[PDB]
Design a protein around this nucleic acid. Sequence first.
DNA 1: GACATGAGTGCC
DNA 2: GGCACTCATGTC
DNA 3: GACATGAGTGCC
DNA 4: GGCACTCATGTC
Lengths: 282, 282, 282, 282
Amino acid sequence: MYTLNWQPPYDWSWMLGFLAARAVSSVETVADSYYARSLAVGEYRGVVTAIPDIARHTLHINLSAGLEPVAAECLAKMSRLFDLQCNPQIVNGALGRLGAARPGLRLPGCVDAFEQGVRAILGQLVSVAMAAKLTARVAQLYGERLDDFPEYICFPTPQRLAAADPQALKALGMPLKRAEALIHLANAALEGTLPMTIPGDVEQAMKTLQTFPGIGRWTANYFALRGWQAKDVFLPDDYLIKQRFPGMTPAQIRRYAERWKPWRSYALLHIWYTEGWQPDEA
Amino acid sequence: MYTLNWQPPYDWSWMLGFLAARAVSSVETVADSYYARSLAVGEYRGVVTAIPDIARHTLHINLSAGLEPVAAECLAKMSRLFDLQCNPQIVNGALGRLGAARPGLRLPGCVDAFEQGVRAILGQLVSVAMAAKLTARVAQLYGERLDDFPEYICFPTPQRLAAADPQALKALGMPLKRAEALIHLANAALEGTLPMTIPGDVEQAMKTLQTFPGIGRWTANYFALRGWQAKDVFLPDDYLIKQRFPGMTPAQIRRYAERWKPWRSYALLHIWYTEGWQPDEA
Amino acid sequence: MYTLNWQPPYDWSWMLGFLAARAVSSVETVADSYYARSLAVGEYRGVVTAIPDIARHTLHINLSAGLEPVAAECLAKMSRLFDLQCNPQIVNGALGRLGAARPGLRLPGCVDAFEQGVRAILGQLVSVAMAAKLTARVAQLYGERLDDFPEYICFPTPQRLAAADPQALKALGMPLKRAEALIHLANAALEGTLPMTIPGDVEQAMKTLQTFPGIGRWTANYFALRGWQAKDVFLPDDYLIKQRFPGMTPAQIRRYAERWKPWRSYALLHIWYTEGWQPDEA
Amino acid sequence: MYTLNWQPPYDWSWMLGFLAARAVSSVETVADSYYARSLAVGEYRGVVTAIPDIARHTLHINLSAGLEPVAAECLAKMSRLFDLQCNPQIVNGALGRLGAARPGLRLPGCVDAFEQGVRAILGQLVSVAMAAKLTARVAQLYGERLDDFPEYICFPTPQRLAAADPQALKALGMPLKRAEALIHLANAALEGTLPMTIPGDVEQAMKTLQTFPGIGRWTANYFALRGWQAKDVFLPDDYLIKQRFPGMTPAQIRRYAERWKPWRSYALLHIWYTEGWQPDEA
DNA sequence: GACATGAGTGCC
DNA sequence: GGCACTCATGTC
DNA sequence: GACATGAGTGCC
DNA sequence: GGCACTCATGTC
């Protein structure tokens, strides 16, 4: 139905693949030709379906009737999720070799910063697939079901998780401390304290984010990257990253990662996805 | 040449008129058959042109070239400014009598919460046309002029205004105390402490805004109404409002306005644009 | 055994009566010729007996053996509770007629500021007799009993009240907010945030007490008067004072008392103990 | 004149030797048989003279005419300075061997925590002798001179030092962050943020102190020790202490010192004044 | 991974 | 020796 | 209009 | 009494 453009190349298999691995049961659905999920904008609700058209560099978005009144916001959320704004020539041009193997690489964003915040936290310490298992359990218990599409369930809203029993969340498969962080975040989201759009000063906003309980430097960075689509942040504390930089302290990796400014976020993604990458033999 | 839907009726004449009076020179151009303004998103800049099509109950939005990369967010911005989500059959079905005369009334949004924040402050105490000309100067001294449409100019950014010298601002025609108010608001916007989208607890978010320097209840209320497009706020402290409720105190006015929950914002716009309106014997 | 002298005239009859009305059963014992109570100074505990000998305008202080290692501190405390430093000539000289009927008048201090802090809070709203009873129940439940004096009991320490159960204090016959106030005051004392000795800037100091939950202007002022024995404070908010200045509001009363500076604390006492008094309608 | 008791043994030779090296000209005089200094208790000023009487196991205190109205408070100040409360049999029971060589060791206190805070600061990173002359310059440049005893000047009040030029101080012979410290400390005192008497929670109170500009863990510790006469603190960050524990780290010292709870303050003194002392190699 | 403890650098 | 910046530990 | 004092009013 | 909320009043 609705259509948005993008500049080539765009590696849709990598992107769908990436989203598929972290997908949450009942919320999202990923296949090789499309992406689709439940979506709430205020108290408007429905299902969004995105279908890329490689041929014409266009992404077709479809909205169930419930979302129509806020169609444009729905489109905006989709474009931030798929990084339709990226100009590969600028990025791949600046990263040289690091990006030559997958010039179609994009930054997987989110559809709602609060959700991404809940997602980032649950992803602490555990595996990617394990966090999806956990997020699925949290959603199942606190998310609203779509009347028009019982198969789908909306990601738990800020007000619901805000009014949730720490013990209940703990019971889902996380420490008390973790669940306390989720509830805290929900309140910031209610009060309008959790930036939902990227702030002008990402570094400062991340420092503030770090005062939040349960949110350390890793979480604030990952969240800035996915939740704000901040394009210049590296994850020197990441698990996989520590392995791509065999025997290197976080500050070292961060110093090294500086050669990729102002697109560190993209360099990070290329490293995560370059099987045998290794720092320059210099 | 993008396009969005709206539900009838829609009083464009009224809307364009409201924006027309407040149009800030070089930034926005308002006419009978279209609206157009400079628009910044991150660092993509261009000019937006909105042309209503009463025939097809549709709104045609056209973006220049420096905005196409982020088209979707631009579209979301116009849909918030023009209240496209509004179901008039629902609001009037609730307001009843009060809104029967101008059923096509809509809530004039904003394209960015920071800007709206600046306009709110720069509109304290002074007349409308005044605030416009003043605001136009600020945009003149801090605006990012377009290299594709030099005629137009972007609205100041939080950082371009957070690094502004008060005196220089005051010199434009405003007390110091207020010039400071901007600078502050600018910082808050920089570190993501100024909700850019409507928060869950609109009352709370307003209380927090009231701590800010130069921001009082009237400013917060008005900011929520236009900056967040909050639908259920009334402005009992407003100049014109006090006259519409002769002799009543803020609390009385507020007590009365409770008869229009949850659309007090629409109630307010109808009462505002109804010379000679008066409260009942209730 | 120990002796401390004073300046004639000293109205012991009045001093003992005042303290008599507010005596806390099991903590203090007030007779017509002597005063005595439990006393703790760190881990040093015992009983204190003060016998005033008018003949030789001297005060005789006896100390149980448990307090002997800290005799001086016990002595300084008795001297703060009995205002032995007062120079009746100077005060009565700067007060004139107001302090004619009872020139032996002294400012009733305290033996511990945290205690006086608890008294001030419990003294809120209820009558002197109720405060006394109320305070008595708190003592009975949290106080330390003296092994050599089973009839006596030490006033509750911050360590105990800080750990108290809000509901337990409530059960003693006090609003929850009052018990929470007590628990917060105790935590401050433990932390060192409660000025236990008069600060150089009483105004700043009180304004800082008023941020404490449960403590308002009245309590702060009254705490300063008794707990710091500050000599220049009035209680324009006092009940009995409001009746001594019919029709006048706090500020009016406060503008009137400026005449008596810098001994407003004394003035306050006299106007308090002269049922007839009434201002000089300017 | 006045007499205070003390339990034997009491090493007066040492105590006076301690205070004598740190004596501040014009403020205090120290001799083989007595100690004396200016003293301000509110608006009362004078000279205090302390003369130990080994025969009677007693301390004789003499007050100049201006301190009589607040004699007991003066006596209490002297008791905290000379640690008359100490029961050497208890402290030496615990300490065991460590203090076997000087069973009469006492904790040199202070007569005012503020002064002690100032002293603690001015004595940072310098020599005992230097701090004395440095402090004296400050005393002179901002003190109160006694009319009845011209060669004596009362230590600077919080007010005076609060309103001191942050350069006139650097002048006397100290850095800038050095005069910042004093000036901050002084304001703290004016308002009541600096505990003037030992807090129920020493650790917590010290933490807060460490937030003070210029006040680090060493200062906070030493301040607890002398300004509050806390008896169970230790100074692992002290220069000389490190040498007494060759090599060892500030947490291993702490770990080893734990064996002297709850009299670490005494243990500290013995270790300081026992040169060839070295920990158990065990 | 978040968070408090501890260390050792290293500069005014 | 106050004070900002890291790393290395060790439960949760 | 924001913002201090500053009283009143109504519940804890 | 504490305290949040409410209605002047005066200033910039």
